[PDB]
């Protein structure tokens, strides 16, 4: 089957250009149409363009027109997509697609819908620089809850897990982006009250971004 | 300009449930060009009907679309555990996406159980505050959080996320980040949240007193 497959997740400051990728192993490479969607963080889908990797054709919507470039590349059968003057709300997730075809295999004919898509790539466009995360501890007051704060980090994502992945009650919650640029997630879990001056909790943070690996305890807070 | 809108906004279902989203368009769509798509959270799209009623194979059956002119429907004869995600339509005969329709599972209306976090001590060794108001496991998901410092209304100082729909209970998590300066406090004393749903009869009050 076809198989798409994009490159890894950038960070871009306003202004600059970003660049991305899509290897298309598998079918025909030239015939087909590859268009780009984009979408931001929840947000709806919008469709950018598309390129058919001969000739080459390409179409842009109206939004990006002048601000945009998509480019073939049969030799290595990979499309590209070029967004320069970039601004915080072009920071969203990019999809490229190829359409789907029927009758017979890679010699078929277009149906227009796209039948084919890549894992998608992130792009944060900010103006902040890459940073740890603080992870402070939110101590419990049946069931009790519990759990840890993971604040002020750059740029998403951040991976939280308990008892390194030993899961039930577990509720990560998405971030937030602060008015201070960085973003900031809480995760907590529900335990028995009765297991809390005994049992150990430690929520295990990992942020890859920024090289930064935290394990920090949650036990009981006393006055 | 050909514009999609997507009808409901969100639509709650039970499993096994007969499902029906509808897609408008501002005007003609040229040769029945018009695709279904579903999304889940964390997921790139996937096509589920493409030329207004032609389904791709590898797509249940269960999916099926019709419609013409100006007006399509996506019907999912009985809802499964895995349909429930986020449809979007699109034209294509420049290309155009709806504004999307999540479905989601209708349960038995769920109290949130309401939690208040205070500040750790280590985080204050840094100079900075951050009191977290959680809503537990609740249904549905529309939920009223209020912030009270001494009893007084607060605003723009907080920000708050919901989680997805929980694929057991089919519950929602909510969690109230009100976050400022050591200034506004030690200058205050007592914090409260109070939350109103459905769920509850009266609004639920958590509080804790400063260093006590």
């Known amino acids: 089957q076809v198989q798409l497959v994009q490159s890894g997740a950038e960070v871009k400051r306003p202004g600059s250009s970003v660049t991305v990728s899509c290897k298309a192993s598998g079918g025909s490479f030239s015939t087909y149409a590859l268009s780009w969607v984009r979408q931001a963080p929840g947000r709806g889908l919008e469709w950018m363009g598309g390129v058919i990797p001969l000739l080459t054709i390409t179409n842009y919507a109206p939004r990006f027109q002048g601000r945009i470039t998509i480019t073939a590349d049969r030799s290595t059968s990979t499309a590209y997509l070029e967004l320069n003057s970039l601004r915080p709300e072009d920071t969203a997730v990019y999809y490229c697609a190829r359409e789907g075809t029927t009758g017979w295999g890679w010699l078929g004919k277009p149906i227009g819908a796209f039948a084919h898509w890549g894992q998608g790539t992130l792009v944060t466009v900010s103006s902040a620089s890459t940073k740890g995360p603080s992870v402070f501890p939110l101590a419990p007051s049946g069931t009790a809850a519990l759990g840890c704060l993971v604040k002020d980090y750059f740029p998403e994502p951040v991976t939280v897990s308990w008892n390194s992945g030993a899961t039930s009650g577990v509720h990560t919650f998405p971030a937030v982006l602060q008015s201070s640029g960085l973003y900031s997630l809480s995760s907590v879990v529900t335990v028995p009250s009765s297991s809390l001056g005994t049992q150990t909790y430690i929520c295990n943070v990992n942020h890859k971004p920024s090289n930064t690996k935290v394990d920090k305890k949650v036990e009981p807070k006393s006055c | 300009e050909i514009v999609l809108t997507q009808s409901p906004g969100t639509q709650s279902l039970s499993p096994g449930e007969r499902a029906t989203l509808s897609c408008r368009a501002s005007?003609?769509?040229?040769?029945?060009?018009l695709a279904w798509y579903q999304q889940r959270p964390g997921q790139a799209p996937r096509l589920l009907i493409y030329?207004?009623?032609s389904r791709p194979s590898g797509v249940a059956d269960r999916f099926s679309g019709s419609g013409s002119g100006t007006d399509f429907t996506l019907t999912i004869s009985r809802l499964e555990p895995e349909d429930f995600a986020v449809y979007y339509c699109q034209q294509y005969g420049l290309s155009t996406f709806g504004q999307g329709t999540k479905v989601e599972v209708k349960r038995t209306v769920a109290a949130p159980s309401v939690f208040i976090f205070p500040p750790s001590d280590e985080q204050l060794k840094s100079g900075t505050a951050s009191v977290v108001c959680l809503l537990n496991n609740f249904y549905p998901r529309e939920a009223k959080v209020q912030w009270k410092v001494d009893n007084a209304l607060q605003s723009g100082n907080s920000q708050e996320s919901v989680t997805e729909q929980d694929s057991k209970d089919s519950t929602y998590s909510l969690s109230s980040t009100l976050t400022l300066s050591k200034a506004d406090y030690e200058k205050h004393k007592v914090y409260a949240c109070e939350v109103t749903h459905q769920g509850l009869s009266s609004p639920v009050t958590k509080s804790f007193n400063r260093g006590e």
């Open positions: 005007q003609s769509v040229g040769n029945n060009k």
């Open positions: 030329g207004a009623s």
